[PDB]
Write an enzyme that holds these catalytic residues in place. Structure first.
Site, PDB file in Angstrom:
ATOM      1  N   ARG B 124       0.871  -1.172   0.000  1.00 24.96           N
ATOM      2  CA  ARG B 124       0.000   0.000   0.000  1.00 24.96           C
ATOM      3  C   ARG B 124       0.910   1.225   0.000  1.00 24.96           C
ATOM      4  NH1 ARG B 124      -2.865   0.251   4.790  1.00 24.96           N
ATOM      5  NH2 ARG B 124      -1.440   2.000   5.339  1.00 24.96           N
ATOM      6  N   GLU B 142       4.801   7.102   3.048  1.00 27.44           N
ATOM      7  CA  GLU B 142       5.616   5.907   3.162  1.00 27.44           C
ATOM      8  C   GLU B 142       5.042   4.841   2.227  1.00 27.44           C
ATOM      9  OE1 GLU B 142       3.482   3.748   7.068  1.00 27.44           O
ATOM     10  OE2 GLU B 142       5.603   3.462   6.554  1.00 27.44           O
ATOM     11  N   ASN B 144       4.184   0.801   2.274  1.00 27.15           N
ATOM     12  CA  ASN B 144       4.013  -0.330   3.210  1.00 27.15           C
ATOM     13  C   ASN B 144       4.203  -1.655   2.507  1.00 27.15           C
ATOM     14  OD1 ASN B 144       2.485   1.523   5.353  1.00 27.15           O
ATOM     15  ND2 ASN B 144       1.579   1.897   3.348  1.00 27.15           N
ATOM     16  N   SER B 149      -3.413  -3.073   6.109  1.00 21.77           N
ATOM     17  CA  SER B 149      -4.796  -3.184   6.576  1.00 21.77           C
ATOM     18  C   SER B 149      -5.818  -2.470   5.736  1.00 21.77           C
ATOM     19  CB  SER B 149      -4.972  -2.544   7.965  1.00 21.77           C
ATOM     20  OG  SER B 149      -4.089  -3.036   8.936  1.00 21.77           O
ATOM     21  N   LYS B 314      12.309   2.739   6.011  1.00 20.92           N
ATOM     22  CA  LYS B 314      12.366   4.194   5.847  1.00 20.92           C
ATOM     23  C   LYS B 314      13.729   4.567   5.256  1.00 20.92           C
ATOM     24  CE  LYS B 314       8.458   5.723   7.481  1.00 20.92           C
ATOM     25  NZ  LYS B 314       7.608   4.759   8.205  1.00 20.92           N
ATOM     26  N   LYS B 372      11.533  11.096  11.776  1.00 17.71           N
ATOM     27  CA  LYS B 372      10.888   9.778  11.847  1.00 17.71           C
ATOM     28  C   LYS B 372      11.851   8.665  12.253  1.00 17.71           C
ATOM     29  CE  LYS B 372       7.783   9.380   8.529  1.00 17.71           C
ATOM     30  NZ  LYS B 372       7.048   9.266   7.230  1.00 17.71           N
ATOM     31  N   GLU B 376       9.469   0.737  12.750  1.00 15.90           N
ATOM     32  CA  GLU B 376       8.005   0.941  12.623  1.00 15.90           C
ATOM     33  C   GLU B 376       7.198  -0.078  13.445  1.00 15.90           C
ATOM     34  OE1 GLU B 376       6.937   1.000   8.535  1.00 15.90           O
ATOM     35  OE2 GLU B 376       8.979   1.429   7.836  1.00 15.90           O
ATOM     36  N   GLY B 377       4.118   5.699  16.847  1.00 13.18           N
ATOM     37  CA  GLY B 377       3.666   7.032  17.177  1.00 13.18           C
ATOM     38  C   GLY B 377       4.793   7.850  17.772  1.00 13.18           C
ATOM     39  N   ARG B 455      -7.736   7.159   4.879  1.00 17.91           N
ATOM     40  CA  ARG B 455      -7.702   7.196   6.344  1.00 17.91           C
ATOM     41  C   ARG B 455      -7.641   8.654   6.779  1.00 17.91           C
ATOM     42  NH1 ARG B 455      -9.069   3.562  10.160  1.00 17.91           N
ATOM     43  NH2 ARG B 455      -7.394   4.276  11.545  1.00 17.91           N
TER      44      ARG B 455
HETATM   45  N1  LIG Z   1       6.464  13.806   5.651  1.00 11.95           N
HETATM   46  C1  LIG Z   1       5.302  13.978   6.349  1.00 11.95           C
HETATM   47  N2  LIG Z   1       4.559  15.159   6.257  1.00 11.95           N
HETATM   48  C2  LIG Z   1       3.401  15.235   6.999  1.00 11.95           C
HETATM   49  N3  LIG Z   1       2.952  14.238   7.803  1.00 11.95           N
HETATM   50  C3  LIG Z   1       3.638  13.052   7.930  1.00 11.95           C
HETATM   51  C4  LIG Z   1       4.830  12.914   7.192  1.00 11.95           C
HETATM   52  N4  LIG Z   1       5.385  11.713   7.417  1.00 11.95           N
HETATM   53  C5  LIG Z   1       4.566  11.105   8.277  1.00 11.95           C
HETATM   54  N5  LIG Z   1       3.507  11.893   8.606  1.00 11.95           N
HETATM   55  C6  LIG Z   1       2.380  11.523   9.560  1.00 11.95           C
HETATM   56  O1  LIG Z   1       2.661  10.460  10.461  1.00 11.95           O
HETATM   57  C7  LIG Z   1       1.845   9.300  10.401  1.00 11.95           C
HETATM   58  C8  LIG Z   1       2.755   8.096  10.739  1.00 11.95           C
HETATM   59  O2  LIG Z   1       3.987   8.209   9.984  1.00 11.95           O
HETATM   60  P1  LIG Z   1       4.353   6.896   9.129  1.00 11.95           P
HETATM   61  O3  LIG Z   1       5.619   7.093   8.362  1.00 11.95           O
HETATM   62  O4  LIG Z   1       3.210   6.505   8.330  1.00 11.95           O
HETATM   63  O5  LIG Z   1       4.565   5.850  10.318  1.00 11.95           O
HETATM   64  P2  LIG Z   1       5.218   4.360  10.731  1.00 11.95           P
HETATM   65  O6  LIG Z   1       6.344   4.685  11.665  1.00 11.95           O
HETATM   66  O7  LIG Z   1       5.717   3.823   9.454  1.00 11.95           O
HETATM   67  N6  LIG Z   1       4.232   3.283  11.235  1.00 11.95           N
HETATM   68  P3  LIG Z   1       2.859   2.510  10.647  1.00 11.95           P
HETATM   69  O8  LIG Z   1       2.121   3.502   9.842  1.00 11.95           O
HETATM   70  O9  LIG Z   1       2.058   2.081  11.879  1.00 11.95           O
HETATM   71  O10 LIG Z   1       3.432   1.331   9.891  1.00 11.95           O
HETATM   72  C9  LIG Z   1       1.368   9.410   9.015  1.00 11.95           C
HETATM   73  O11 LIG Z   1       0.214   8.722   8.636  1.00 11.95           O
HETATM   74  C10 LIG Z   1       1.216  10.925   8.874  1.00 11.95           C
HETATM   75  O12 LIG Z   1       0.044  11.494   9.436  1.00 11.95           O
HETATM   76  N1  LIG Z   2      -2.639  -6.580  12.505  1.00  9.41           N
HETATM   77  C1  LIG Z   2      -3.632  -5.656  11.953  1.00  9.41           C
HETATM   78  C2  LIG Z   2      -2.959  -4.269  11.721  1.00  9.41           C
HETATM   79  C3  LIG Z   2      -1.806  -4.310  10.670  1.00  9.41           C
HETATM   80  C4  LIG Z   2      -1.214  -2.882  10.546  1.00  9.41           C
HETATM   81  O1  LIG Z   2      -0.942  -2.220  11.570  1.00  9.41           O
HETATM   82  N2  LIG Z   2      -1.028  -2.441   9.280  1.00  9.41           N
HETATM   83  C5  LIG Z   2      -0.473  -1.089   9.048  1.00  9.41           C
HETATM   84  C6  LIG Z   2       1.031  -1.179   8.671  1.00  9.41           C
HETATM   85  S1  LIG Z   2       1.323  -1.897   7.022  1.00  9.41           S
HETATM   86  C7  LIG Z   2      -1.254  -0.367   7.931  1.00  9.41           C
HETATM   87  O2  LIG Z   2      -1.099   0.983   7.869  1.00  9.41           O
HETATM   88  O3  LIG Z   2      -1.992  -0.964   7.142  1.00  9.41           O
HETATM   89  C8  LIG Z   2      -4.303  -6.184  10.653  1.00  9.41           C
HETATM   90  O4  LIG Z   2      -3.821  -7.178  10.099  1.00  9.41           O
HETATM   91  O5  LIG Z   2      -5.351  -5.538  10.209  1.00  9.41           O
HETATM   92 MG   LIG Z   3       4.958   1.991   8.415  1.00 11.35          MG
HETATM   93 MG   LIG Z   4       1.833   4.866   7.938  1.00  9.80          MG
END
Ligand SMILES: Nc1ncnc2c1ncn2[C@@H]1O[C@H](COP(=O)(O)OP(=O)(O)NP(=O)(O)O)[C@@H](O)[C@H]1O
Ligand SMILES: N[C@@H](CCC(=O)N[C@@H](CS)C(=O)O)C(=O)O
Ligand SMILES: [Mg+2]
Ligand SMILES: [Mg+2]
Ligand SMILES: Nc1ncnc2c1ncn2[C@@H]1O[C@H](COP(=O)(O)OP(=O)(O)NP(=O)(O)O)[C@@H](O)[C@H]1O
Ligand SMILES: N[C@@H](CCC(=O)N[C@@H](CS)C(=O)O)C(=O)O
Ligand SMILES: [Mg+2]
Ligand SMILES: [Mg+2]
Lengths: 481, 479
Positions: B124, B142, B144, B149, B314, B372, B376, B377, B455
């Site tokens: 995604r 980012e 994924n 999900s 990242k 960041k 991987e 709040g 989202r």
């Molecule tokens: N470059 C950016 N500019 C503005 N908002 C950002 C930016 N990067 C991240 N964010 C915000 O932060 C949230 C989480 O950052 P993200 O990189 O998606 O997290 P993560 O550490 O990868 N974990 P997860 O999403 O749970 O897998 C995002 O959905 C955004 O709301």
């Molecule tokens: N374990 C749960 C949540 C998985 C999850 O946290 N996915 C994140 C990281 S890829 C997303 O943004 O979809 C599921 O399978 O629905």
């Molecule tokens: Mg992530």
């Molecule tokens: Mg994210």
């Protein structure tokens, strides 16, 4: 099933059920209606003889026609049945008598042509009687108003089909032959009937809607939602959910045409579909009786209207057991015969020849009967040897408030499991086969008459760690054999 | 704007349609009674997204799928910068990346059976619509690469809003939106189709099933159920739900073929689909890491396998912002340009030239960035960055990346609904685009766009609390 197998099967059921809306609100859901529970259901289908199921399906249009003809006869103010019904209604002034009074009010002159088409959305319920080796579906009662479960029926049937086809009942493969797994389309079919009534309304003249008249804080709303969604997605018809308060507050009738409208939206209501108004507690004040009358006087097609509702009385069910009476409504020899074989003996408890025999049987051989009240839904049937004591406790003149019905004796299914609120119960169950049927008719003609699907309600009654007389009902499914 | 009564009725319409259709989630502690579930947090109305932006995001997904498939394939080679970059990341993050890397190395050992080289990436790509000086452009938050999900619930929230429009619930007099502009995702069906494709590839190499590897006490079960049901009803393929405990207790590998089986049922597993194993807490003991290795060594096709999961770091996201690095994986000039257009500036914080530039920027102009953590709040925003960095040893700043802050416009005209309470707060909306690609060590066999997601979330200080807010599922109305 093993202990671990049952637990995994239970979570498969909760998961599939929630994903598919096989749900119901718990008590006090009002505090948070964003949450709901899996509907009580059996884990496996319950065996039903194919011959019995086919007979039940085949006779439904005959019952639909019969009750339509009874309603039409009742609708003639100068008929014997009109008088007969008034008499029965006046004996139950707190409920049936109020419905009758509303009906008489609809007989008054109107400035507009009255709506004479009505839609009967019915369900005939059966127990499979087994006496001296003869298996015969026998009618428990005929439901003429606000019949439940057409929507959830489709879902419990698909739940069990899924568990079979997806190797959940057995990881090695299906344990049932899919050709024997009944899959009801009752949700779709009831919606089709409602659309048929909308078609009838339009033919007498626009994007009118179906008004669902519902109970305040209805817990079985997901069953109803299936119909609302089907009407829109399959028949492009919108609808609204209205309690009697909403009817009083938001609707008005055009004096010149009788047409029913929602005030602030101008939406025109083609059909008034009742999912409330069948028991005394549904009318919380005189204003609710006024709301029902208001709807009945309008040009919208009622489903059912007052008389159709009244035609499903226990007194009429009793009356119909007399071949001579039946023949006044169904003259076809074979249909008449088919109907009579689904009937058990039913007697009145009044001073007529038949009533005197009923009184004699109630006291001399009570073990063979169930005493049932003419006012329905109170959960007050009196069974077998308990009958004499009950009757002796009230004046003989008031025995006419009941009918004496021969007890149907089905076989119990000892091999199913009931699931409710994540708890399972391994108890013998009794299963009541329901067959839906919908008929559109007016004062004299019958425009549409169809079989509309099936239902299987099962329940257990036992005294164990859960309590004395513990037990409740649930949705089951059918495996034919 | 809805009047109190109109909104209260609309809220019950939503609750009723959602429950009837399974647009649901388990609440906390649902373990106490899993026969009860709640309506998923959702917006009441769709959120506007420019059609040009949406189309761009859809069209570019296969390019991102190809890019990460190629990166994964390169990572397998001992001398690639990526292979090396990942090793360093495995030291910095030995508790997670380090453990995944060690499992990967273990899969390199010889086996007596031919190994499975096809893997399925179910990805995604997430975007925010950047708006700077009138310049509107989707920018990637980012990418994924594991356990993404909401593909199932996405279909349902899109259909919820479509229904409210077509059934005259948003307005009793008629629809308020043009249905041609209402996006209706088929991501549930499309992810199921991709899993079926992996099953097809597994069969081509010989009634196998898809094993869903799930978190213990997963609350988002209904989102996953959509895929299980589709696999069965649309693709005649069975599936099972297994936690790592189940993998350890119930599965075995045939030593001669490496094929994966459920011990007492004899069911053969064609595909191992991960819906857990993406964060440290998903592995509760060494036994869980062993369960993951066991699955990875088997002949089943993994979705995703270890390297594919590792490709979505990242660090790699940061490295790809350099055209020369990107050019090692994407040779087409136009595809390269399209990718670059979706990237904001992203810097290391190590002592490489780019890293020293990142350090300068983080301290001199922090308001334009978000810091960041590589694991991987924990994001640290704008002016809070210098204080956070000053609090840790400079040598450890390499545990983060410095990313230019994307600045989207907030939707101030939506209502968020959760547990029967509505919130009328401005929201930020992140566009997600699903994509699935089946590939092996060198070839890419199927590469498709697989649906969308929106989202949304709010964050405010008001009667509900300081920094109150949460996320929910939204839908798209194009314009
Ligand atoms: N470059 C950016 N500019 C503005 N908002 C950002 C930016 N990067 C991240 N964010 C915000 O932060 C949230 C989480 O950052 P993200 O990189 O998606 O997290 P993560 O550490 O990868 N974990 P997860 O999403 O749970 O897998 C995002 O959905 C955004 O709301
Ligand atoms: N374990 C749960 C949540 C998985 C999850 O946290 N996915 C994140 C990281 S890829 C997303 O943004 O979809 C599921 O399978 O629905
Ligand atoms: Mg992530
Ligand atoms: Mg994210
Ligand atoms: N003749 C019978 N023989 C055996 N069991 C019976 C018989 N009649 C009724 N029952 C049982 O009693 C239940 C209730 O009787 P029923 O006639 O359906 O009641 P009701 O007063 O009409 N209420 P409702 O079903 O809510 O409209 C049935 O579903 C049966 O389990
Ligand atoms: N008001 C509820 C329940 C109506 C009801 O009690 N129906 C009975 C009597 S017809 C049934 O057996 O279906 C609903 O609409 O589902
Ligand atoms: Mg009944
Ligand atoms: Mg009844």
């Amino acid at each position: 099933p093993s202990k671990d197998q049952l637990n995994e099967l239970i979570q498969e059921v909760n998961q599939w059920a929630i994903t598919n809306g096989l749900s119901m609100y718990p008590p006090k859901f009002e505090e948070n209606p964003s949450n709901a529970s899996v509907s009580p259901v059996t884990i496996y289908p319950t065996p039903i003889p194919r011959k019995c199921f086919d007979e039940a399906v085949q006779i439904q249009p005959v019952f639909n026609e019969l009750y339509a003809r009874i309603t039409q006869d009742m609708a003639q103010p100068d008929s014997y049945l009109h008088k007969t019904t008034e008499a029965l209604a006046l004996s139950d002034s707190e409920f049936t008598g109020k419905l009758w009074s509303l009906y008489l009010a609809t007989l008054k002159s109107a400035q507009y042509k009255k709506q004479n088409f009505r839609l009967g959305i019915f369900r005939s319920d059966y127990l499979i009687d087994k006496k001296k080796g003869t298996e015969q579906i026998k009618q428990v009662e005929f439901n003429t108003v606000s019949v439940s479960f057409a929507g959830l029926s489709e879902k419990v049937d698909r739940l069990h089909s899924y568990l079979n086809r997806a190797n959940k009942y057995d990881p090695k493969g299906p344990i049932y032959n899919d050709q024997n797994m009944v899959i009801s389309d009752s949700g779709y079919l009831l919606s089709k009937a409602l659309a048929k009534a909308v078609e009838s309304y339009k033919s007498q003249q626009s994007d009118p809607i179906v008004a669902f008249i519902v109970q305040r804080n209805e817990r079985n709303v997901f069953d109803q939602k299936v119909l609302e969604l089907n009407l829109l997605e399959k028949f492009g018809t919108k609808s609204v959910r209205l309690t009697f308060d909403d009817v009083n507050d938001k609707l008005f009738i055009d004096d010149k045409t009788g047409k029913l409208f929602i005030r602030d939206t101008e939406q025109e209501i083609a059909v008034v579909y009742y999912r409330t108004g069948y028991t005394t507690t549904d009318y919380t004040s005189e204003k609710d009786w006024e709301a029902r009358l208001f709807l009945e006087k309008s040009f919208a097609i009622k489903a059912p209207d007052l008389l159709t509702q009244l035609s499903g009385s226990k007194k009429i069910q009793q009356l119909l057991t007399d071949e001579g009476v039946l023949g006044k409504y169904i003259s076809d020899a074979e249909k008449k015969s088919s109907l009579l074989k689904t009937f058990v003996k039913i007697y009145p408890l009044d001073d007529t020849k038949l009533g005197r025999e009923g009184k004699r049987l109630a006291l001399s051989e009570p073990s063979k009967y169930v005493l049932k009240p003419q006012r329905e839904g109170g959960g007050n049937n009196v069974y077998k040897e308990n009958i004499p004591n009950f009757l002796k406790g009230i004046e003989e003149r008031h025995w006419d408030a009941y009918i004496l019905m021969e007890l149907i004796e089905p076989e119990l299914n000892e091999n199913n499991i009931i699931l409710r609120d994540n708890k399972s119960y391994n108890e013998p169950i009794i299963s009541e086969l329901g067959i839906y049927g919908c008929v559109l008719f007016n004062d004299e003609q019958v425009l549409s008459n169809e079989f509309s699907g099936s239902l299987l309600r099962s329940k257990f009654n036992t005294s164990n760690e859960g309590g004395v007389a513990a037990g409740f009902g649930c949705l089951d499914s059918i495996i034919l054999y």
